[PDB]
Amino acid sequence: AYTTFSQTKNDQLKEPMFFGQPVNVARYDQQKYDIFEKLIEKQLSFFWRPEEVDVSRDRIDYQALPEHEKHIFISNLKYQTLLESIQGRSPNVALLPLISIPELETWVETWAFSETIHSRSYTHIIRNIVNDPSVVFDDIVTNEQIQKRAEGISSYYDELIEMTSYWHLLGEGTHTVNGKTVTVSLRELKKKLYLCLMSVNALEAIRFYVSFACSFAFAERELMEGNAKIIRLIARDEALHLTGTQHMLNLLRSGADDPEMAEIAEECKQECYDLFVQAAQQEKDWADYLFRDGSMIGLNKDILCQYVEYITNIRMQAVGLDLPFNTRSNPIPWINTWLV
Amino acid sequence: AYTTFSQTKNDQLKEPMFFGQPVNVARYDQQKYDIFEKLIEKQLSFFWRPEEVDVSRDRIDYQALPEHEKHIFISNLKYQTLLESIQGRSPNVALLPLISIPELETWVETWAFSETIHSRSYTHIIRNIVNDPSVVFDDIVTNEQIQKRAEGISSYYDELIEMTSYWHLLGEGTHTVNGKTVTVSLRELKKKLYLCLMSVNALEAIRFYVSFACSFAFAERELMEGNAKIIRLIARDEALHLTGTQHMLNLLRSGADDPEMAEIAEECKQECYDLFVQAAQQEKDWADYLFRDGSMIGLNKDILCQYVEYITNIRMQAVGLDLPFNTRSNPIPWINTWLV
Numbered sequence: 088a089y090t091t092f093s094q095t096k097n098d099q100l101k102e103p104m105f106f107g108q109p110v111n112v113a114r115y116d117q118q119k120y121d122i123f124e125k126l127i128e129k130q131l132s133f134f135w136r137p138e139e140v141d142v143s144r145d146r147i148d149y150q151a152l153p154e155h156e157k158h159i160f161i162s163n164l165k166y167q168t169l170l171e172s173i174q175g176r177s178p179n180v181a182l183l184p185l186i187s188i189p190e191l192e193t194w195v196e197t198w199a200f201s202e203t204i205h206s207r208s209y210t211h212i213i214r215n216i217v218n219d220p221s222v223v224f225d226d227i228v229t230n231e232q233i234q235k236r237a238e239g240i241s242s243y244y245d246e247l248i249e250m251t252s253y254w255h256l257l258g259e260g261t262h263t264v265n266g267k268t269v270t271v272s273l274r275e276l277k278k279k280l281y282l283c284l285m286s287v288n289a290l291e292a293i294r295f296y297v298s299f300a301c302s303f304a305f306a307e308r309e310l311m312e313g314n315a316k317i318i319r320l321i322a323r324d325e326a327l328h329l330t331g332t333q334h335m336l337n338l339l340r341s342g343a344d345d346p347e348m349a350e351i352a353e354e355c356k357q358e359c360y361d362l363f364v365q366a367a368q369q370e371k372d373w374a375d376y377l378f379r380d381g382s383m384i385g386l387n388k389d390i391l392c393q394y395v396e397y398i399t400n401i402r403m404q405a406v407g408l409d410l411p412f413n414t415r416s417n418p419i420p421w422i423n424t425w426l427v
Numbered sequence: 428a429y430t431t432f433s434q435t436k437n438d439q440l441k442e443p444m445f446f447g448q449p450v451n452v453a454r455y456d457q458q459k460y461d462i463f464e465k466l467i468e469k470q471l472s473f474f475w476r477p478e479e480v481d482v483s484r485d486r487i488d489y490q491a492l493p494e495h496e497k498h499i500f501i502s503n504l505k506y507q508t509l510l511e512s513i514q515g516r517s518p519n520v521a522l523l524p525l526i527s528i529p530e531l532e533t534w535v536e537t538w539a540f541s542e543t544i545h546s547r548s549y550t551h552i553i554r555n556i557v558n559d560p561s562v563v564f565d566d567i568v569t570n571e572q573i574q575k576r577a578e579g580i581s582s583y584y585d586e587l588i589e590m591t592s593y594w595h596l597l598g599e600g601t602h603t604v605n606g607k608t609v610t611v612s613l614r615e616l617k618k619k620l621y622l623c624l625m626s627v628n629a630l631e632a633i634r635f636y637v638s639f640a641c642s643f644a645f646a647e648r649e650l651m652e653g654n655a656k657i658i659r660l661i662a663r664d665e666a667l668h669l670t671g672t673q674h675m676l677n678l679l680r681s682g683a684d685d686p687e688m689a690e691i692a693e694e695c696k697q698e699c700y701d702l703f704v705q706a707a708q709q710e711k712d713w714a715d716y717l718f719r720d721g722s723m724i725g726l727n728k729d730i731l732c733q734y735v736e737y738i739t740n741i742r743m744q745a746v747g748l749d750l751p752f753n754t755r756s757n758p759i760p761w762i763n764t765w766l767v
């Protein structure tokens with residue numbers, strides 16, 4: 088039931104963010120939610136190209152690095168790479184088919200485009216510090232260590248995409264497919280989207296900020312500056328992305344866009360709380376692999392874990408959830424000079 | 428049966444362009460087909476922002492235009508806006524789920540992204556020349572003459588998107604759904620893909636160039652110069668887009684990438700020919716509507732129809748189809764001043 092161009096003339100200012108009539112005309116002179124247009128404008132003003140950044144000295148720095156420090160750096164790089172690979176394609180495949188207002192549709196495509204730039208920035212870095220990228224990229228797919236901290240991400244997406252297909256093909260109701268009953272409920276599909284968005288918010292607001300900490304730690308000891316410039320640029324974009332998800336979630340919760348959503352959100356309550364708790368726990372567990380062969384002066388499992396708790400409470404509070412960790416001060420205040 | 432991150436370790440250099448294992452890692456250090464990486468790089472170096480273009484004198488230019496010329500300029504602008512709205516979302520929703528090589532996946536997202544900048548530019552022009560933009564945007568969806576093309580284009584995308592869902596959900600074979608038999612054939616799905624591709628090739632290779640001629644006809648008279656600067660940037664991007672689909676089609680029909688597709692394209696060869704000739708005929712009928720109230724300096728239904736046949740012959744030959752019209756030279760060589 089999906090269409091690339093709905094022939095019905097509708098007031099786009101009256102459609103909900105999701106599940107309404109598919110967007111037909113792309114206009115930007117007006118918007119139901121001005122914030123998405125502001126995010127497109129900001130992101131476009133930040134346009135950058137990784138190839139231009141000078142990472143020529145990073146090879147000398149990396150080579151001089153002690154083995155366990157090479158391990159920490161390259162492992163952080165492999166994870167960032169896997170997350171961006173998924174973020175480059177997923178927002179378009181999972182959200183585009185469900186969006187019903189123009190500014191949000193375009194923001195999703197701009198956001199996803201920026202992710203492919205990040206992925207491209209990692210190839211730029213890898214190529215300039217290793218003799219063969221092929222070894223780095225192949226290890227990403229294998230090595231359960233990586234897949235372990237990331238387990239569940241592709242899960243939330245894949246499930247949303249499949250239920251969305253059944254909905255477009257069969258419509259709401261109970262059906263018979265090859266002799267088996269299949270139920271299609273819009274209420275359950277709306278729940279699937281909210282949970283997905285929450286997982287994405289956790290990915291960009293928490294999982295990525297933990298990785299930045301590891302990157303900037305090297306920058307503090309005046310090493311890997313080429314990588315550092317790029318990470319600052321990526322972090323500047325990520326702040327825009329997390330703002331977008333925070334607004335999507337809070338607007339859906341308010342009930343002003345779709346009352347049924349506010350009702351479902353109250354039911355999603357414990358589930359979204361738990362997925363944030365699970366993500367936080369996965370980041371900590373990943374620390375065990377990062378510091379397998381040893382840690383660094385100002386960075387170790389303990390400090391990283393404190394930062395995970397510190398940032399998770401901040402992110403969860405921003406979307407109205409209760410805080411799972413003890414309140415604390417920033418454990419690595421030096422990172423502030425690198426962000427913003 | 429689609430996944431945002433396939434857990435199987437595969438050689439991305441040995442996968443077909445389409446219908447293979449879904450892309451897992453996003454890397455840009457190598458590629459099966461260099462053309463797509465080349466295209467991503469060129470498109471990125473061309474980055475521009477419509478806001479930067481001064482269109483402050485276009486308002487007075489438009490008001491002073493005779494009645495029939497306003498009709499021409501605005502009808503053309505609305506058709507362009509229509510196609511751009513479709514091209515900004517469709518390649519993503521229709522192709523991403525079927526691609527199996529990383530360079531092609533990112534090119535498609537980069538391509539789609541560039542189209543949303545084109546949509547943004549038309550909003551920039553429209554509100555700088557009409558006072559009440561809503562009137563323009565609403566006519567785009569309901570205009571009977573314009574829609575005499577919207578459904579045909581949308582139909583090719585929609586049918587491919589629907590069959591793709593059945594294939595991903597049920598797989599090949601004879602199934603039953605709510606008392607009805609439903610057959611799923613990969614061979615038929617392959618044919619559907621070859622068709623959106625031929626259709627989109629005709630769209631960017633022919634439909635858009637016919638509209639460029641009209642825009643630059645005004646620029647040759649020193650009118651609507653802000654509009655002209657923007658169409659020049661747009662046309663520069665389109666040359667890259669059509670290069671992309673031309674390569675996809677030739678790789679699929681030669682048999683180099685997928686023997687089966689080559690066998691399929693050979694059997695539906697007459698259908699592909701009729702499809703291209705049908706697109707040229709619609710552009711001819713349009714020129715008719717465009718000049719129903721009179722012509723202007725440098726353009727008329729006859730000169731325009733001659734350009735359609737000239738450009739159509741060139742594009743069809745590029746993808747292996749016989750020429751439908753008589754060969755001739757370029758009817759309007761002055762257009763090269765604004766193109767390539």
Ligand SMILES: [Fe+3]
Binds near residue numbers: 205321325
């Ligand atoms: Fe990113």
Ligand SMILES: [Fe+3]
Binds near residue numbers: 202291
């Ligand atoms: Fe992001």
Ligand SMILES: [Fe+3]
Binds near residue numbers: 511514541542661665
């Ligand atoms: Fe375009």
Ligand SMILES: [Fe+3]
Binds near residue numbers: 664
């Ligand atoms: Fe295009």
Ligand SMILES: [Hg+2]
Binds near residue numbers: 287
């Ligand atoms: Hg999501």
Ligand SMILES: [Hg+2]
Binds near residue numbers: 240244283286287
């Ligand atoms: Hg998700």
Ligand SMILES: [Hg+2]
Binds near residue numbers: 301302391
């Ligand atoms: Hg860290």
Ligand SMILES: [Hg+2]
Binds near residue numbers: 622
């Ligand atoms: Hg198509």
Ligand SMILES: [Hg+2]
Binds near residue numbers: 638639640641717
């Ligand atoms: Hg025209």
Ligand SMILES: [Hg+2]
Binds near residue numbers: 637731
């Ligand atoms: Hg024309």
Ligand SMILES: [Hg+2]
Binds near residue numbers: 621622
């Ligand atoms: Hg064909």
